[PDB]
Design a protein around this nucleic acid. Structure first.
Ligand code: DGT
Ligand code: MG
Lengths: 406, 553
DNA sequence: TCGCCCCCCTTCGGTGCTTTGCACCGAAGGGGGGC
């Protein structure tokens, strides 16, 4: 078959990102994997005259106890031409988030049957490191549509459509959405009856070449206000600063008849009785925060952004937005691994879950603002990553003035 | 011999052409060293004569080798390198003897004339034009181009390393139980075979290299311990660094101190407890490498301590894969940390230190976390796994940190070790207001263009204060306001500010800072008994805050 | 009068914030070590 011409965006050059250190078992997995891929012609060994590189590592899902090679092509994808400009990419079905159970399938291997534009292959180079630098790094580049490259689902688009047509025609009310290397497959079948149709789809695939989500239960988490019977000055200074911040999100929120309560230089633990106009002002503000914001709409042309705050007790709140203070979704992620005691694992899992929700809902992942030191994140996050995609992220140090989302 | 291996195609950067730079003058001892290398190099096909058709040139020179009597031909390809394509370097790091395993039989080999045994892409050779001057006046020099990798070209190391890897690949796959550490042209070859069978494999390896144009001269073939390798000495059971000679000086220049600090960092990989904070401080604010810098008393003490350590002989041991790795950290003061990595007690694999100051404001717990992260990364590099940690921080202290701190943080499997001084939080902020304690409504403001500012407070018990401030900033005044409330308050205090900034710093529980002013506040926070700190939005007429915001107006 | 690699310590300068300095961070200066 004939390769599709592919270019970087104008004025950009290929990725030049250093390989980071890898554990013994990840290096072993990759040597085994890349060796086998080399024999099958999917990659070729290259030298240092190719000046591009992309980090490579390996993940292993507990419920699939084999390793999965993961090339972090985030940089290459940012620099790759758009196929929306060139009319090859994928659309998002609005019905997927309506389904009762969504299963995630890794169909990365379907790409390895299509060759890649030979002028573009050099941009896919990666380097396998060596324990104690016993040897120089070993470099490969791709000869076929790589896993994790955004041009792969676009180029393989028409192929994937034809593979799936019989299944989608036989199961009209199952919704399949391709996101990168994954198929997101939702239906309203009883759980065991869902899993059987997934096995059927897996079979239709193997005649050419995870665990269950529940958008049903992705509740939104609002801004709540404390309920008590007695109120101190500090309770009301914290209530006011909170509502003042919230007046950047909601409309017509009032602080005048609660600030009045505090007039005077008062003791923080001084119990101040609510007036009836403060009770009116409070129960009123309470309801505005109850039901959601009027006038917030998804814009597919703009990026998604996700913020996360650590709240303790293994709890994690998050907001997804494209414009400041116009949240498309507020939520709260809670862990259950067992110990209670790994923040970086919890945050890494919170990030995969939030990004998974954006794919189901809007069809793409958000750029994350992560509440963690860059170097702490980079020391550990690959130990807990379980997805075939990686979202964009940046690192923020944001002291809470208000515990706004709790 | 010239390897028959394929040449690596290499380009100039687009739009760029080749270097046109004149040879400078050289001594007659160096001209004769080059002529002999060069006439010989032409006879081995390493270089070829060129003529005026080739417009390029680049300067050449020569240094001596540690092979005391031989010379090293170098070309100043700075100009060619700029215009040469980029490469992806395949040397990702430096092997460490602590990552070696005990081997029954060991050999160290070095390839002769390594770079000159690898051919250079034929289309690129014309850009390597140079000239040998021969005492300058009497003749225009004799001109050559390289046919093989030049020493001084940006691409030569990686192309050689890549070529060596390919040449070694067949032998490695045929002998998976023979460890070959391949660093540039230096081969460490370890095996668990008997010496006789081992030396058979060596011959085989050496014959394999010779077929591909890589000689292994006897002079660089080490057969017996101690093996000289990568600046270390490998014995069967242990390893040492080659001797470290510290500068001795009555008068110290900036450059001398830079050299001294670098030596000590190199030593810190096996000498425990090395410190360079006070010596490095001396380089701050200096303006020339030759500026005399007087050693402070603290730098003299630190130097003295380091000399006592360097006087005691040390050795590392080798890695036993069947045992756990253990990393133990001690606190040394002033943001300095030292660590040891062992498997059996008092048999260190290696040591090291962490002393970087990250951020303007931090605390010991954060810096301990950074040390942990440095050690973890280093351990992946050397042994492919992270170690078990023994840390001088109570489990209670850590739990108190990662619950009240708003960022995700973590340490892997670790064990408390009572080695004072211990890492600890130097104060904590009450998460609830404190009954009976005074309430301070603090505020500070500065005129953005004027340099002038005011810091002050008002109090529930009725107290009142304003402080003129000169040459300040908006953020400083807020810090000063906090500075005052802590200063004029009892051991228990409640405080209220409207600087998200100040709240951010203090709430992170810093115990040190590049800011003298923040240090003072830290000082004062440590002396207090309880402190509740609270924030309110500015300029919305809140009780107390409005009283003080008015007052500071 | 050179090249490539890792490390540490200092200095400088670009970025973005509902800023007017400030904190963060990558790069480049110096040094150590390797071939
Ligand atoms: N540009 C440059 N390359 C060096 C330098 N030192 C070593 N190399 C490179 C080039 C050498 O060919 C290669 C191996 O180092 P060696 O010390 O063994 O020199 P070489 O093998 O060429 O000669 P030899 O027969 O071993 O004495 O590493 C240097 O100072 N400058
Ligand atoms: Mg040599």
């Amino acid at each position: 078959i004939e390769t599709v011409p592919v270019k970087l965006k104008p004025g950009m050059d290929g990725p030049k990102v250093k390989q980071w250190p890898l554990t013994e078992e990840k290096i072993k997995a990759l040597v085994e994997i890349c060796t086998e891929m080399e024999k099958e012609g999917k990659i070729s060994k290259i030298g240092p005259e190719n000046p591009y590189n992309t980090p490579v590592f390996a993940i292993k899902k507990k419920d699939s106890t084999k390793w999965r090679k993961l090339v972090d092509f985030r940089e290459l994808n940012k620099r790759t031409q758009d196929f929306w400009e060139v009319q090859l990419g994928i659309p998002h079905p609005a019905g997927l988030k309506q389904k009762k159970s969504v299963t995630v399938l890794d169909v990365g291997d379907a790409y390895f049957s299509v060759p890649l534009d030979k002028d573009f292959r050099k941009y896919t180079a990666f380097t396998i490191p060596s324990i104690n630098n016993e040897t120089p790094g070993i470099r490969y580049q791709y000869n076929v549509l790589p896993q994790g490259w955004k041009g792969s689902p676009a180029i393989f688009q028409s192929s994937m459509t034809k593979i799936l047509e019989p299944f989608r025609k036989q199961n009209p009310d199952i919704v399949i959405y391709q996101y990168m290397d994954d198929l997101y497959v939702g239906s309203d079948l009883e759980i065991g009856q869902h899993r059987t149709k997934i096995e059927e789809l897996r079979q239709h695939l193997l005649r050419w070449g995870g665990y269950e989500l529940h958008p049903d239960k992705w509740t939104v988490q609002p801004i709540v206000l404390p309920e008590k019977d007695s109120w101190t000055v500090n309770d009301i200074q914290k209530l006011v600063g909170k509502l003042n911040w919230a007046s950047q999100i909601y409309a017509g929120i009032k602080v005048r008849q609660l600030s009045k309560l505090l007039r005077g230089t008062k003791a923080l633990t001084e119990v101040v009785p609510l007036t009836e106009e403060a009770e009116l002002e409070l129960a009123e503000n309470r309801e505005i925060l109850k039901e959601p914001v009027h006038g917030v709409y998804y814009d597919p042309s703009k990026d998604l952004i996700a913020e996360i705050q650590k709240q303790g007790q293994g709890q994690w709140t998050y907001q997804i937005y494209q414009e400041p203070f116009k949240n498309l979704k507020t939520g709260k992620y809670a862990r259950m691994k067992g110990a209670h005691t790994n923040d970086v694992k919890q945050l890494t899992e919170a990030v995969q879950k939030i990004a998974t929700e954006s794919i189901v809902i809007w069809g793409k992942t958000p750029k994350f603002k992560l509440p963690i030191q860059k170097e702490t994140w980079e020391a550990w996050w690959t130990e807990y990553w379980q997805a075939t995609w990686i979202p964009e992220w940046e690192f923020v140090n944001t002291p809470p003035l208000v515990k706004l989302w709790y | 011999p010239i390897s028959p291996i394929e040449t690596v195609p290499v380009k100039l950067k687009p739009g760029m052409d080749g270097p046109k730079v004149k040879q400078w003058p050289l001594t007659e001892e160096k001209i004769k060293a080059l002529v002999e290398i060069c006439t010989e190099m032409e006879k081995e096909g390493k270089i070829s004569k060129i003529g005026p058709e080739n417009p390029y040139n680049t300067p050449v020179f020569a240094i001596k080798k540690k092979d005391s009597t031989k010379w090293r031909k170098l070309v100043d390809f700075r100009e060619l390198n700029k215009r040469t394509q980029d490469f992806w370097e395949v040397q990702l790091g430096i092997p460490h003897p602590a990552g070696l395993k005990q081997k029954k039989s060991v050999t160290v080999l070095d390839v002769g004339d390594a770079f000159y045994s690898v051919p250079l892409d034929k289309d690129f050779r014309k850009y390597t034009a140079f000239t040998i001057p021969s005492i300058n006046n009497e003749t225009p020099g004799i001109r050559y181009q390289y046919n093989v990798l030049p020493m001084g070209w940006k691409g030569s190391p990686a192309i050689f390393q890549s070529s060596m890897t390919k040449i070694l690949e067949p032998f490695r796959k045929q002998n998976p139980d023979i460890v070959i550490y391949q660093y540039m042209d230096d081969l460490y070859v370890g095996s668990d075979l008997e010496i006789g069978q081992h030396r058979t494999k060596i011959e085989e390896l050496r014959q394999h290299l010779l077929r591909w144009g890589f000689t292994t001269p006897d002079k660089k073939h080490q057969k017996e311990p101690p093996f000289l390798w990568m600046g270390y000495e490998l014995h069967p059971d242990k390893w040492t660094v080659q001797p470290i000679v510290l500068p001795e000086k009555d008068s110290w220049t900036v450059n001398d101190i830079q050299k001294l600090v670098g030596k000590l960092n190199w030593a810190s990989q096996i000498y425990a407890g090395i410190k360079v904070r006070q010596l490095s401080k001396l380089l701050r604010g200096t303006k020339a490498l030759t500026e005399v810098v007087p050693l402070t008393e603290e730098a003299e003490l630190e130097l003295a301590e380091n000399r006592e350590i360097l006087k005691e002989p040390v050795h590392g041991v080798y890695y036993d894969p069947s045992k756990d790795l253990i990393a133990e950290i001690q606190k040394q003061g002033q943001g300095q940390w030292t660590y040891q990595i062992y498997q059996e007690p008092f048999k260190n694999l290696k040591t090291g230190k962490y002393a970087r100051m990250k951020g303007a404001h931090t605390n010991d717990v954060k810096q301990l976390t950074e040390a942990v992260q440095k050690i973890a990364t280093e351990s992946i590099v050397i042994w492919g796994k992270t170690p078990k940690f023994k840390l001088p921080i109570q489990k209670e202290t850590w739990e108190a940190w990662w619950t009240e701190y708003w960022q995700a943080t973590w340490i892997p499997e670790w064990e408390f070790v009572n080695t004072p001084p211990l890492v600890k939080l130097w104060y904590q902020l009450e998460k609830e207001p404190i009954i009976g304690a005074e309430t301070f409504y603090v505020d500070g403001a500065a005129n953005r263009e004027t340099k002038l500012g005011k810091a002050g407070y008002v109090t529930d018990r009725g107290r009142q204060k304003v402080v003129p401030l000169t040459d300040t900033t908006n953020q400083k005044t807020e810090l000063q306001a906090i500075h005052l409330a802590l200063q004029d308050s009892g051991l228990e205090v409640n405080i209220v500010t409207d600087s998200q900034y100040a709240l951010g710093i203090i709430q992170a529980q810093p115990d040190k800072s590049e800011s003298e002013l923040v240090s003072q506040i830290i000082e004062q926070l440590i002396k207090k008994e309880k402190v509740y700190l609270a924030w309110v939005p500015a300029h919305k007429g809140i009780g107390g805050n409005e009283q003080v915001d008015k007052l500071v107006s």
